[PDB]
Design a protein around this ligand. Sequence first.
Ligand SMILES: CCCCCCCCCCCCCC(=O)SCCNC(=O)CCNC(=O)[C@H](O)C(C)(C)COP(=O)(O)OP(=O)(O)OC[C@H]1O[C@@H](n2cnc3c(N)ncnc32)[C@H](O)[C@@H]1OP(=O)(O)O
Length: 373
Amino acid sequence: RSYQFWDTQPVPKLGEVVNTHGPVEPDKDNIRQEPYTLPQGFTWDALDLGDRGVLKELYTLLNENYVEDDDNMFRFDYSPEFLLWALRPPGWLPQWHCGVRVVSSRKLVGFISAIPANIHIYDTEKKMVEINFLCVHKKLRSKRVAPVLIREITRRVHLEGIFQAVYTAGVVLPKPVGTCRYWHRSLNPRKLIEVKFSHLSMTMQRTMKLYRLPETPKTAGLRPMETKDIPVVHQLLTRYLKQFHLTPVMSQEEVEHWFYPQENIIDTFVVENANGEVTDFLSFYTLPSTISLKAAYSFYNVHTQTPLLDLMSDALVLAKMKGFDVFNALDLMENKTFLEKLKFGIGDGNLQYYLYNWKCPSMGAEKVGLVLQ
Ligand SMILES: CCCCCCCCCCCCCC(=O)SCCNC(=O)CCNC(=O)[C@H](O)C(C)(C)COP(=O)(O)OP(=O)(O)OC[C@H]1O[C@@H](n2cnc3c(N)ncnc32)[C@H](O)[C@@H]1OP(=O)(O)O
């Protein structure tokens, strides 16, 4: 049905079923040096997120114009510190924070970002980028600025010798490598009824009773992750992710950056057993939503000794302790084993996973081992 942009891109066609593994087109051995042309009156600006004024401009763009949840009651609320965590992992490059501004006023009307990541896709491990935070101001919508943003970040990533990318979207584009669903678990139902995040089925008081949790976790030895846990968390994660077909491959520095706890950004808890050994961990990140609503998002949960269902029940208890109103998790990895048992309900809409310039068979949600922010 005619994707005018995506039909020119090195991606599989929709409905074409891929039994091969590999690049769609050859690597470019000479790359366009000039930026692509924006519509009249707009210009590229690389955003330095170390400048507090510029970082404020970006989260103002994103808080007003970014992904809205399905029924448009709520939009994500991004703190500066959350953006620094997500946009400056190890290896971040300044040209990959790619802004669009009005020429005359220098107002920030658009953004797209790339961060480097090593991606394990089936039997191949390849250095790639993760594309995130594509955003166009509500007043600039449907002007074909998004294809220019995408071509321009592609060129900038090509200049660094990286020809593959991974990204997610809620829309269907050619062609998903995997499709996931959102599930939500009510922590503070009373507050969720007011914003109309939820509704009563049947009584206010038995809903609270249905969703009530213990005040402290069940698992012995659960404690926040510390610096001395970085190597074992790294080793548990790498071994755990081998069972999935699409996963990140993290160095120990990346493990520190993604999992080391930062208040109101990311929490990690390890299970240290009676021997002093760390056998398990759970993690979730913080993303509030504006009308605020404090939501937790399952990140990476690794179990060796503790059963997965016990780990996630403890995660729910910890999130509630910290004042989260809701706990969100995708149906990927092993999550379908605890989702219904722990009283998650299913959300609206799909998260589709994609590869750029890598053709490969699609996979079931349970084989997707990658969580983005
Ligand atoms: C080797 C390195 C490669 C690196 C690049 C890898 C590829 C990365 C690709 C980007 C990864 C994004 C990862 C994330 O961050 S996903 C989150 C995307 N952000 C939002 O949804 C925030 C709110 N919405 C917006 O800001 C705008 O609606 C956006 C910017 C999404 C589109 O702006 P607009 O509404 O004004 O439309 P247009 O006239 O300018 O252009 C319309 C074109 O956009 C296609 N479209 C719509 N939505 C998406 C989407 N989420 N991914 C890819 N394509 C998308 C559409 O099919 C059409 O093309 P085609 O149908 O004619 O063919």
